[PDB]
């Protein structure tokens, strides 16, 4: 009987306050939070039936009113992009019911973007190519294609841990000859200063 | 110490029986079965306290049956599988001990069993993998080099992409699409395409002794499954594409 | 700590030969709860002997009521044999009218 | 009639692998609930045993004891080595609420027959007899916030509401007046023991004495008020006198059910 917003955007490095509503949360009803990454099963984060808990990953605050709870992620990392589930469990009950949860989207902080569109060549073929729209800030959003034989993936962020660098990226490809590097991401609002080499 | 679910991926013909296994953590009294559909949360199916099935209210039909004879390993059996049964079956175990200090009383979940039910297995195809070498224009402008991998024409979405550098798997500088693209979004039940990127420094790509490989693990048919097509059986396999460093 | 059973045998109604009655054996001072209580007709254990659920007093010692439907007579003899850990041998308490 | 509702526990630990719990529900001396350990289901001994509570709250209560009994043995068997306990041992428990001078809730524990703990203002008060184990256990159970918070709601919120409803749901069987049956008999020990028997009275308060006309006899030896099946009581009042002394003696019985007309038996 928990209610949580279906989606939530959070800036990388900031605190993520994940709200959860439950009418009762009795003296012995618990509050458990689970995290779920793509193609994986849920993982325990924190729990608490009364006293607000502060473990090594997150912090749980139950209102003294007890009709709502909030999960605090002090500094949101990219690794924190997951579906967060708020579950209530009466002490003696074993069955755990999951709702739809909150889709937390940790927006990467791109410090020095140099948006550009580069053309990549196949290792084992002749003019089998992809177009890569990279290094744009997170405020940019990559749109799908109108053309049936033109495939465009959505934005994806990579972390070069050693160098301490994060970059946003998108790929486009097609078999048709009309397809060019300069007009692959035309259906998208790309920054006016996007670098187009030739 | 984890919960083991097998098979992790399963392609099944409509009308056939399927058996899912769950090996929980030794000593855990509680075992729970869940079903998860795309964009939804886990849904309760059945719960066990040792060998006793105390609550099985969440079972979809007459065809779903679960057992834990020795109070450890559980088996969820789906009979006459239908397309609507396609989901991720999750299994969890919990110690079921009184929660004091340091006792989380948490649910330890397995990796899950992705079940895909098809009318005909004639629609199952393995991926085709290609590696696209970095743009000289990017190397010069940024002093970084992005490799792109294209896994294409696979069905169903039962793939696991990974980048390998000099025999060792790499995670740093990698990003794979969270969901794949339909090669024909208009056509119902079309094959998929998935891309991934690996970003290294210009200097690392410009060393010719460095070997880069994109590895896609496909989960398809098994020896037990029937294949009556002239083309190669779309079995569980690894399809890969490599690339060596180019100096300049 | 340990406590020895206090056995008290008694009929529900006054003894009248050839008329259905009930014989009781109230065991009320023992510890631990483990005990063996048999109601016997001429030294032979009565098969149909019912008893109360285990209960205890404010001093934590246990009590139990043992009872059975029976027809008394002068010829027939009835007693309550109680065997416990605090007893060296089964303590047989006879029923007097 | 009854003024207190309480549930009792008796867990028997024979070996490091075996344990057996015994539980029941009581309105003072009258049992209204039982517990079937095999299925983990309560036994309602009277039609009004559920009180005014719906089958939704009665099933929830049954689950708490089902979980509590199943879990109780494994907790203490694992912590038997921690509290230096040796098999065989026996745990006892009593809890519930009682109408007083206004309802007061209570909970008591006991190991080996000796006191172990008590609850005053929702806190683990150890018992001096229990010793260091009672000190260690109360310092251990405080951490088990799930157990502590469940016993609170059960003691101070669901019990008082239950006590009132069960007293009213079955007043016909708690307030009823059962007339006793009295008869006289001769004891073994020229000298004679004059035995009086009062059987089948309800409620428990009763006046039984041997008399010389209208004069009371101080030498009467009132026995124990023994339980009589079902929900009636048994009592004997003996008198040791001379062979000639027996003449002009009577056993007088006074009880609430008798309504002025007392049982007067001569001999
Ligand atoms: C009818 C009318 C009402 C009458 C009411 C009368 C009063 C009754 C009081 C007695 C009731 C029994 C208490 C039930 C407590 C309870 O169930 O909560 C528990 C459920 O688990 C268990 O009992 C585990 C077994 C517990 C055995 C431990 C022994 C402790 C003995 C009790 C100590 C009493 C001191 C209290 C002092 C203050 C919360 O478990 P989680 O620690 O959160 O772990 C969650 C998972 O469930 C674990 O499996
Ligand atoms: C069960 O009965 C409880 C009390 O018994 C009755 O009280 C009088 C109504 C009396 O005439 C007779 O019928 C019974 O002796 C109820 O609890 C009490 O409810 C009253 C409601 O006015 C409240 O003032 C009391 O504080 C409350 N507690 C006690 C200890 O008396 C139960 O009522 C329910 O629970 C209450 C807490 C409240 O929410 C009320 O509205 C509910 O009906 C009775 N019902 C059950 C199923 O428990
Ligand atoms: C170590 C110290 C242990 C503390 C002991 C606490 C004992 C509390 C009493 C709980 C005993 C449980 C008995 C279960 C039986 O109860 C019933 O049958 C009544 C069911 C109520 C449904 C209405
Ligand atoms: C434990 O004690 C009981 C006492 O009746 C006995 O029957 C049982 O066999 C013992 N346990 C084992 C494992 O032998
Ligand atoms: Cl597998
Ligand atoms: Na352009
Ligand atoms: Na395992």
Author numbering:
A (entry chain D): 3 to 200
B (entry chain E): 2 to 249
C (entry chain B): 3 to 99
D (entry chain A): 6 to 106, 109 to 196, 200 to 277
Sentences copied from the publication:
The human CD1 family of antigen-presenting molecules (CD1a, CD1b, CD1c, and CD1d) is structurally related to MHC class I (MHC-I) molecules with the key exception that CD1 proteins bind lipidic antigens. The CD1b cleft is much larger than the corresponding clefts of other CD1 proteins. The unusually spacious cleft allows CD1b to capture either two small lipids or particularly large lipid antigens. Recently cloned TCRs, termed PG10 and PG90, mediate autoreactivity to target cells that express CD1b, and the response was augmented by adding micromolar quantities of PG.
The PG90 TCR binds to and recognizes the PG antigen with high affinity and specificity, and the ternary complex provides immediate insight into these characteristics. The PG90 TCR docked approximately orthogonally over the long axis of the CD1b antigen-binding cleft, whereupon the TCR α and β chains docked over the α2 and α1 helices of CD1b, respectively. The PG90 TCR was positioned centrally atop CD1b, where it made extensive contacts with the phosphoglycerol head group, forming a total buried surface area (BSA) of approximately 1800 Å2. Here, the CDR3α (270 Å2) and CDR3β (410 Å2) loops were the principal contributors, providing 26 and 40% of the BSA, respectively, followed by the CDR1α (120 Å2; 12% BSA), CDR2α (100 Å2; 10% BSA), and CDR2β (90 Å2; 9% BSA) loops. This snug fit of the distal glycerol components of the PG ligand between the TCR chains correlated well with the observed specificity of the PG90 TCR for PG in preference to other phospholipids that contained the same PA core structure but lacked the glycerol moiety. However, the placement of the PG head group was markedly altered upon PG90 TCR docking, where the PG head group is shifted by 6.0 Å and locked between the CDR3 loops.
